Design a protein around this ligand. Structure first.
Ligand code: HTD
Ligand code: HTD
Ligand code: MG
Ligand code: MG
Ligand code: NA
Lengths: 802, 802
């Protein structure tokens, strides 16, 4: 247990805590300005001149003094209440507030020994911010205390609420920009309070940083009436509190006392809610939220060159753009830095004075030190059930190609038992698709958690105020809740219809960026569990839907995060349920990855046994010798290769026909896509020798790919024999139609694959056969048109091994 | 002018209109069930049996009777008030309500002559829905009345509000699913009422289709208290009205009278607001919105197999999944279809009776016929200013490589004058980035439109309650408002920082899908203006930002919509401002496209004159002969090729050095990326002959690409000499750093490009030179580290022609 969770003080905040908060605010404003502006002379020692100012002034001031003020108060709260706390910096361009917080709390020097608590360390700290060879401008993963960089705005609330799930002792004050709140993902994130339980989860306090402006405009929420703003937050299930300061001549000490009193009222309300939830965990409370209204750039010069800067969008980026080049800007910068009276805040040796930090929390309660902000320190391996009990044994009993299994059902049973063995640290998220994607065996041991109204057992089923599945119709929610659940040390999986994965392409990009930086150069940030995403209801089988819903292209996006041997991104094609089991076990063991797991949920053949799946997954791509009819690679006339359940089924059927014609070939299945890249691009890929062994040195390769052919063409560009691959993929063709028609119109159907193999082998010799196969495709299409279902010869085919 | 906009009735709805609405509701419910279930015998003529039921039951019933009810009432309103109206079907899986609406209003038979108003046309209409060779399951672009297919939920409100901008006579009732409202994009779409003006724009009525459920769960908004739900809509600037029906034994005629009375109250309020706005167009009104609470699947069987179906998520998809296979399901289907009493709704010849449609609107007021729902019928070409006045003449006066122009400033001046010439039909959207991306010359002739609070001219600048620029910090808003502005026949452009384009990858995918279907097989849906997106503040120059903000990967996504010679997607690299002018003119003339226009906003050289830019754009890729030093392709030792402003600058500098060494080369710039694809993949690309002429038959090609090398490798896979291309692109390397460092770490800097050229030519001979160039790169990096700015020899280089 960290600290003493949810304790009230029952005494006023001390005057000494008020004095310390004002010193914190002054010193963190001072050092945030130092980071932006100063390449040397951090204490302004004689002579202090333009030569001390950076040549490239970069970073963001406007949000920063508001964050510094909130961080003083959150620090005071954590210390007084001993409260286990992670904050979220929504406006992550306020990085200098977050580096300052860590430098003050002592974690910065602990993690970065060269940046010492003295004049020399302070000079280094100022120069390195947003500087070549230095540190980022945003609240990046290399900053102690961050689980959210906040460069791409919108995810602050989903990360806050995912952090508190199954984390009943954790408090997350979530600082949200008022520009940020105009984003879609932020706007829906407020609604998460219907999906958490006040007894079994922790508590988020949203704090709207209502500073009136974004970069070049006021914000929507800052200019609507007070009555609408309060109605809005009350309508989303919060009790809104509002603080206003900095717009008149109120002295700063008065402001601190008034805020501390308010923040104690609010925290008391949170403690009452946590106490009450021990007895009534079914009534959803109105959680407090805070409207924090202060002038953007607070405490900077009110006017610069005749233009209003404090209290304006003009304070957003870097005021005094001429601070190095003109004596006029320089003198303004000088008076601004001096207004914080740094001579009272630092000792002559440049260390921050003891009376600046005596109010601060200590040890693992520090923001920079709490292990929830470095969740791989808390993470334990899952207790995984044995895989063999889930195996589809039909392949071993009856033959390759057996049965009509819906592949994700096996992963559902596996997930069910993972939750049973790990009952508060593995969650399933889904955008109203968990049952649709066949993972609902999990409901045998837990419920979908819903903390909103119930009506009747005639409609409410597998649903309770606490449980380990969470659904909301928002991919942004599911992805953000999961990412934070992982970043604070837990585990899970979510599922999505494949084309809708693209709604969160940019969140996958941010998490891939977080992982890249981390595996490269942040070794104190320990490994977290992987994002595991079941990508199902795919392009080939969108029975109730249609053309608009056919887009397997997240493959292509994930290919753009496969560099530098980071190994943070995997693309897997689950050929069948036994392969899906073997991929899932590997994903659930893995850390510091995004794993995209492609699987079909439609009834489909099972091709491999579980032992075969384990070996083939490790290699990445495998010959299926039992399906090849060639003696060796020299006797091969064509390599039949596929990735994805549906291209594999069609390729297999083509192989059966090609065999019956006397054509010699081998069959190769590809599961771990990026293992096709060359070793130069991927030091864990197939060597050239292993790749030639599979694909031959010089025979044609027909490659039936689940997604856009582009992906495979680009990946194998420097591979031996790549000129001989003919890659058939989805090509933006389809409608709402039968299964045969969907493959037919992308030349993916067995008949067209058989034809393409023949064309690659001898187009002249097989001209007539190719015509007949293309006419069979029309006849099968006409059959579907006339009769309402596909031709039996197509649907009823079973591989001859069965 | 269409109809008589914003007129009140001042009399009760007639009883005859009530009778007609109930008949409409009954006949559209009946035909929606016919579309889902019946392959023949649409009037249930003796014998009606299981053999008439479809073999594959696909589609969505739950939303549909609620849409059918609203469409009866919206139709009655349009007819009585003569009101110019487009609706949005948020729950676009309710396609059968939308096809039914068009069949009833007569547009369906007008657009599709084979689907006649009689028993034979009705049989065809039922069979074709979601059927091979037939029509989509959703409200697709092939349905008269659709501007929004609603398969990927979330964009209903942004499309509604973009439809009404500059459209003061248009009314848009926007039907929003209650599941849909849990999405991010929908949640922020409510806030659009702060960005429209009640005098110069039209009016959206949001109607929340609060049917209590999504696919397998209740919805958040349906289970919160009434008091929170109303506070929520009042807090977002609406006057909420609520209707509840279908949960008790109230007779349907009573329900229609009560709704018609309510909808007249609401429309009266909208007319009052429109009248008042003629005098006070500065006060933002509280626009009505409607909470419509009715049982999901309303009028279907209450229980099926002992399970509650009406009023449940169980009604979402297809009830009676056994209707063809069991007599038990069949008898339930039969009694359900009969409950609507089709014998009163159709004549013996199968035509819909006259008394079913006498209340309906006629002519261009019909939902299916209104030209706002087929905006290419209304669209006129822009009155474009002459391009030559914007030209950067420095190239002609002083030489190739001249000056320090910020390229988008020229497009800003061009846009300024387009707005001047087209003052109510060309809009600019931006996510708080219009000024940042340098398009703010537009503010010389218009303002950012903001219909929310003002404070002071010290902060409010270039901002008014009416204007042709709209900004909100949401890419989903900017993209959705623009798409609808185009779909209703107007024009525009938006700009985004490049990495944030990925927030709306999936909206680009939906609009590309809409365009693909349309150019292929919907010739009555006339061409609309293109989506034009200025992609700027790119990967190479993110001065205040950092690693997290470096992702030019929308290229790769757009490559997945380049099929079938649809020609709906363009990727352009603006080499400089004159090229940006020539690309922009082409984009602003073009129709039925998405145009991604890549340009740097940092000060940069200008390479080509405007005449050169016009020719080179047309070809797609061009030798720059004035920069090549080789006599002919046989004397070329390496082809220096680039796409993007920054790779071009670095390649050019490399060319200067290579020339000074005595190396023979040619320079080729690539603007229209997809013109690199082969003719087999793109019938408008360079022929093989033109491609070899540029890139040689067999010399090495060093290709410096703005984005991920993967894209170019895949595109040129079947091109002559492709094995000799070495593509250098962004490779996930960077930090917050100087301009030289960002190119350096992706091997994109001039020194590394010069080295790579030497390596391709003779790695042994040039081993030492390559070492020296790689050491210069370290020295330049160390200089940046020590000094705070890049080495003068890097920054001060100008191409020798200047
Ligand atoms: C407009 C924009 C920003 C303004 C945010 O203003 P605010 O939130 O009120 O913060 P503050 O405390 O400074 O006043 S930072 C941002 N990061 C972004 N993210 C996305 C998703 N799209 C665009 C940008 C561009 N950038
Ligand atoms: C859950 C989901 C749907 C339920 C929508 O329920 P509702 O809106 O209450 O409609 P109704 O009137 O039927 O009750 S349709 C949908 N389309 C989707 N779009 C996206 C962005 N992600 C997932 C899906 C999956 N699909
Ligand atoms: Mg702000
Ligand atoms: Mg619903
Ligand atoms: Na090749």
């Amino acid at each position: 247990v960290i600290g003493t969770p949810w304790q009230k003080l029952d005494r006023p905040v001390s005057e000494e805590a008020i004095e310390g908060m004002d010193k914190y605010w002054r010193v963190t404003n001072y050092m945030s300005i130092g980071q932006i502006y100063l390449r040397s002379n951090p204490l302004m020692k004689e002579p202090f001149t333009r030569d001390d100012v950076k040549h490239r002034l970069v970073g963001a001031w406007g949000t920063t003094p508001g964050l510094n003020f909130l961080l003083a108060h959150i620090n005071r709260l954590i210390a007084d209440h001993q409260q286990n706390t992670v904050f979220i910096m929504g406006p992550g361009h306020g990085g200098p507030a977050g580096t300052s917080q860590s430098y003050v709390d002592g974690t910065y020097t602990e993690y970065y020994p060269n940046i010492t608590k003295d004049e020399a360390g302070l000079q280094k700290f100022f120069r390195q911010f947003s500087y070549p060879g230095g540190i980022p401008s945003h609240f990046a993963p290399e900053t102690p205390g961050s689980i959210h960089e906040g460069g791409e705005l919108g995810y602050a609330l989903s990360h806050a609420y995912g952090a508190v799930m199954n984390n009943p002792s954790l408090f997350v004050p979530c600082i949200i920009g008022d520009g940020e709140a105009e984003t879609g993902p932020l706007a829906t994130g407020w609604q998460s309070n219907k999906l958490v339980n006040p007894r079994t989860d922790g508590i988020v306090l949203p704090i709207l940083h209502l500073n009136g402006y974004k970069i070049a405009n006021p914000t929507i929420l800052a200019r609507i009436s007070d009555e609408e703003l309060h109605d809005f937050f009350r309508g989303m299930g919060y009790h809104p509190y509002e603080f206003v300061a900095g717009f008149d001549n109120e002295d700063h000490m008065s402001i601190h006392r008034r805020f501390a009193e308010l923040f104690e009222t609010i925290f008391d309300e949170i403690c009452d809610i946590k106490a009450a939830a021990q007895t009534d965990d079914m009534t959803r409370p109105f959680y407090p939220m805070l409207i924090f209204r202060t002038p953007k750039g607070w405490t900077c010069p009110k006017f610069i060159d005749g233009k209003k800067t404090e209290g304006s969008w003009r304070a957003h980026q870097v005021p005094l753009a001429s601070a190095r080049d003109t004596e006029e800007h320089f003198e303004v910068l000088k008076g601004w830095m001096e207004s914080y009276k740094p001579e009272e805040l630092f000792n002559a040796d440049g260390s921050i004075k003891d009376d600046v930090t005596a109010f601060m929390p200590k040890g693992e309660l520090r923001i920079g030190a709490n292990p929830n902000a470095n969740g791989g320190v808390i993470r334990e391996d899952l207790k995984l059930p044995e895989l063999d009990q889930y195996e589809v044994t039909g392949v071993k009993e009856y033959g390759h190609g057996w049965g009509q299994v819906e592949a994700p059902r096996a992963l559902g049973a596996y997930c069910r038992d993972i939750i049973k063995n790990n009952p508060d640290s593995f969650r399933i998220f889904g955008p109203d698709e968990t049952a649709s994607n066949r993972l609902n065996a999990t409901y045998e041991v837990t419920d979908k958690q819903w903390d909103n109204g119930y009506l009747s057992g005639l409609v409410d089923e597998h649903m309770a105020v606490t449980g380990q599945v969470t659904e909301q119709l928002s991919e942004h929610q599911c992805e953000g809740f999961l990412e934070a659940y992982l970043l604070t040390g837990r585990h899970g999986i979510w599922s999505s219809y494949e084309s809708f994965v693209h709604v969160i392409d940019s969140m996958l990009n941010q998490h891939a960026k977080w992982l890249e930086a981390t595996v490269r150069e942040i070794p104190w940030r320990k490994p977290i569990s992987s994002v595991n995403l079941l990508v199902s209801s795919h392009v080939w089988r969108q029975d109730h839907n249609g053309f608009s819903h056919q887009d397997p292209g997240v493959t292509s996006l994930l290919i753009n995060k496969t560099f530098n041997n980071d190994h943070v991104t995997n693309i897997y094609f689950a050929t069948d349920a036994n392969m899906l089991l073997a991929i899932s076990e590997k994903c659930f063991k893995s850390t510091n990855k995004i794993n995209a797991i492609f699987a079909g949920k439609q009834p489909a053949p099972t091709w491999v046994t579980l032992d075969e799946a384990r070996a083939e997954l490790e290699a990445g791509a495998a010959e299926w010798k039992w399906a090849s009819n060639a003696e060796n690679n020299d006797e091969v006339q064509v390599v039949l290769a596929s990735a994805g359940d549906v291209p594999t089924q069609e390729l297999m059927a083509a192989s059966d026909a090609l065999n019956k014609m006397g054509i010699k070939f081998k069959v190769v299945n590809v599961v771990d896509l990026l293992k096709l890249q060359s070793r130069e691009n991927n030091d864990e890929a197939l060597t050239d020798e292993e790749f030639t062994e599979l694909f031959t040195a010089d025979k044609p390769v027909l490659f039936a790919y689940h997604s856009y052919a582009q992906d495979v063409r680009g990946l194998i560009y420097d591979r031996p024999n790549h000129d001989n691959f003919h890659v058939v993929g989805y090509k933006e063709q389809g409608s709402t139609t039968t299964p045969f028609d969907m493959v037919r119109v992308n030349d993916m159907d067995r008949y067209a694959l058989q034809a393409a193999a023949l064309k690659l082998i001898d187009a002249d010799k097989y001209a007539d056969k190719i015509d007949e196969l293309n006419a069979f495709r029309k006849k099968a299409f006409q059959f579907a048109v006339d009769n309402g279902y596909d031709i039996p010869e197509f649907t009823d085919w079973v591989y001859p091994d069965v």
